[PDB]
Protein backbone atom coordinates (compact mmCIF):
# COMPACT_ATOMS: atom_id res chain seq x y z
CA UNK A 1 0.00 0.00 0.00
CA UNK A 2 0.56 3.69 -0.51
CA UNK A 3 0.62 6.13 2.64
CA UNK A 4 1.60 5.29 6.13
CA UNK A 5 1.95 7.13 9.25
CA UNK A 6 3.45 10.45 9.82
CA UNK A 7 4.18 13.35 11.86
CA UNK A 8 6.04 16.22 10.64
CA UNK A 9 6.18 20.27 11.02
CA UNK A 10 4.53 23.04 8.17
CA UNK A 11 6.34 26.10 7.97
CA UNK A 12 4.45 27.88 10.23
CA UNK A 13 5.77 25.45 13.15
CA UNK A 14 2.49 23.88 13.28
CA UNK A 15 2.06 19.75 12.86
CA UNK A 16 0.90 17.94 10.23
CA UNK A 17 0.01 14.15 10.48
CA UNK A 18 -1.40 11.47 8.42
CA UNK A 19 -4.50 11.82 10.83
CA UNK A 20 -5.07 15.46 10.50
CA UNK A 21 -5.18 15.14 6.77
CA UNK A 22 -7.89 12.54 6.76
CA UNK A 23 -11.54 14.04 5.50
CA UNK A 24 -10.37 16.07 2.82
CA UNK A 25 -9.03 14.78 -0.50
CA UNK A 26 -5.10 15.35 -0.28
CA UNK A 27 -2.76 16.52 -3.09
CA UNK A 28 1.13 15.03 -1.73
CA UNK A 29 4.10 16.03 -3.80
CA UNK A 30 7.90 15.35 -3.02
CA UNK A 31 10.77 18.25 -3.28
CA UNK A 32 12.83 20.35 -1.61
CA UNK A 33 14.52 23.74 -0.84
CA UNK A 34 17.08 23.42 -3.20
CA UNK A 35 15.19 22.20 -6.37
CA UNK A 36 15.57 24.43 -9.47
CA UNK A 37 12.80 23.56 -12.33
CA UNK A 38 11.08 20.61 -11.29
CA UNK A 39 9.79 21.87 -7.89
CA UNK A 40 8.77 25.32 -9.07
CA UNK A 41 7.11 23.85 -11.92
CA UNK A 42 4.96 21.45 -10.00
CA UNK A 43 4.42 24.09 -6.69
CA UNK A 44 3.03 26.56 -10.08
CA UNK A 45 0.72 23.96 -11.38
CA UNK A 46 -0.76 22.75 -7.48
CA UNK A 47 -1.19 26.55 -6.80
CA UNK A 48 -2.88 27.02 -9.96
CA UNK A 49 -5.17 24.17 -9.14
CA UNK A 50 -5.89 25.50 -5.72
CA UNK A 51 -6.59 28.71 -7.28
CA UNK A 52 -9.42 26.77 -9.61
CA UNK A 53 -10.59 25.43 -6.38
CA UNK A 54 -11.62 29.22 -5.71
CA UNK A 55 -13.72 29.34 -2.44
CA UNK A 56 -12.97 25.53 -1.95
CA UNK A 57 -9.61 25.57 -1.45
CA UNK A 58 -9.49 25.08 1.99
CA UNK A 59 -10.98 21.77 1.31
CA UNK A 60 -8.84 19.74 -0.01
CA UNK A 61 -5.26 19.66 1.34
CA UNK A 62 -2.33 20.26 -0.71
CA UNK A 63 1.06 18.96 0.47
CA UNK A 64 4.59 19.22 -0.11
CA UNK A 65 7.21 17.40 1.68
CA UNK A 66 10.82 17.57 2.17
CA UNK A 67 12.51 15.36 0.82
CA UNK A 68 15.91 16.93 2.13
CA UNK A 69 15.46 16.81 5.21
CA UNK A 70 19.20 17.67 6.30
CA UNK A 71 18.22 21.64 4.85
CA UNK A 72 14.75 21.89 4.58
CA UNK A 73 13.47 23.58 7.99
CA UNK A 74 9.87 25.17 8.32
CA UNK A 75 12.02 28.36 7.55
CA UNK A 76 13.34 27.27 4.15
CA UNK A 77 9.92 26.22 3.50
CA UNK A 78 8.04 29.13 4.54
CA UNK A 79 10.47 31.13 1.92
CA UNK A 80 10.44 28.52 -0.75
CA UNK A 81 6.45 29.09 -1.13
CA UNK A 82 6.33 32.69 -0.52
CA UNK A 83 5.12 33.49 -4.21
CA UNK A 84 3.09 29.95 -4.52
CA UNK A 85 -0.54 29.98 -2.92
CA UNK A 86 -0.93 30.61 0.83
CA UNK A 87 -2.87 27.01 1.26
CA UNK A 88 -0.20 24.71 0.66
CA UNK A 89 1.88 23.23 3.51
CA UNK A 90 5.42 22.22 3.02
CA UNK A 91 6.48 19.63 5.43
CA UNK A 92 9.89 19.25 7.31
CA UNK A 93 11.46 16.98 10.19
CA UNK A 94 13.75 14.53 11.27
CA UNK A 95 15.69 12.83 8.46
CA UNK A 96 14.29 9.48 10.32
CA UNK A 97 10.97 10.58 10.28
CA UNK A 98 11.29 11.65 6.59
CA UNK A 99 12.70 8.58 5.66
CA UNK A 100 9.46 6.30 7.23
CA UNK A 101 7.35 9.07 4.53
CA UNK A 102 9.66 7.94 1.74
CA UNK A 103 8.97 4.27 2.39
CA UNK A 104 5.39 4.67 3.28
CA UNK A 105 5.05 6.44 0.19
CA UNK A 106 7.15 4.24 -2.33
CA UNK A 107 8.94 7.94 -2.98
CA UNK A 108 12.36 7.90 -4.85
CA UNK A 109 15.11 9.56 -3.55
CA UNK A 110 18.98 10.13 -3.93
CA UNK A 111 21.42 12.71 -3.65
CA UNK A 112 23.10 13.45 -6.32
CA UNK A 113 26.63 15.57 -5.51
CA UNK A 114 27.72 18.19 -7.83
CA UNK A 115 30.60 19.90 -5.63
CA UNK A 116 31.69 22.45 -3.06
CA UNK A 117 28.99 20.90 -0.75
CA UNK A 118 25.98 21.26 -3.29
CA UNK A 119 23.83 18.35 -3.99
CA UNK A 120 20.62 17.45 -5.80
CA UNK A 121 18.42 15.12 -4.48
CA UNK A 122 16.49 13.05 -7.87
CA UNK A 123 13.02 12.30 -6.83
CA UNK A 124 9.82 11.80 -7.31
CA UNK A 125 7.84 14.19 -9.14
CA UNK A 126 4.21 12.94 -9.71
CA UNK A 127 1.50 14.16 -8.04
CA UNK A 128 -0.24 11.54 -5.55
CA UNK A 129 -4.05 12.04 -5.11
CA UNK A 130 -5.45 10.73 -1.87
CA UNK A 131 -9.05 10.10 -1.40
CA UNK A 132 -10.94 11.81 1.72
CA UNK A 133 -10.41 8.65 3.55
CA UNK A 134 -6.69 8.86 3.26
CA UNK A 135 -6.50 5.82 0.41
CA UNK A 136 -4.19 6.37 -2.69
CA UNK A 137 -6.74 6.96 -6.13
CA UNK A 138 -3.92 7.23 -8.71
CA UNK A 139 -0.88 10.22 -9.83
CA UNK A 140 -2.81 13.30 -10.00
CA UNK A 141 -2.92 14.42 -13.81
CA UNK A 142 -2.06 17.80 -14.34
CA UNK A 143 -1.82 17.89 -18.41
CA UNK A 144 -4.29 19.78 -18.61
CA UNK A 145 -5.92 23.19 -17.52
CA UNK A 146 -6.23 24.05 -13.70
CA UNK A 147 -9.80 24.45 -14.51
CA UNK A 148 -9.59 20.79 -15.64
CA UNK A 149 -7.66 19.48 -12.82
CA UNK A 150 -9.47 20.83 -10.28
CA UNK A 151 -12.83 20.04 -11.67
CA UNK A 152 -11.68 16.32 -11.44
CA UNK A 153 -10.30 16.92 -7.90
CA UNK A 154 -14.07 18.38 -6.82
CA UNK A 155 -15.58 15.01 -7.44
CA UNK A 156 -13.45 13.84 -4.60
CA UNK A 157 -14.97 16.52 -1.94
Given at each position: AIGGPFQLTDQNGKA???KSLKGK?????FGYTHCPDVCPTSLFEISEVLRAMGKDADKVNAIFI???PERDTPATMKNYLSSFDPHLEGLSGDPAEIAKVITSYRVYAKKVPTKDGDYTMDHTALIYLMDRDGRFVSPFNLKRTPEEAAADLKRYL
Open positions: VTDPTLIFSVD
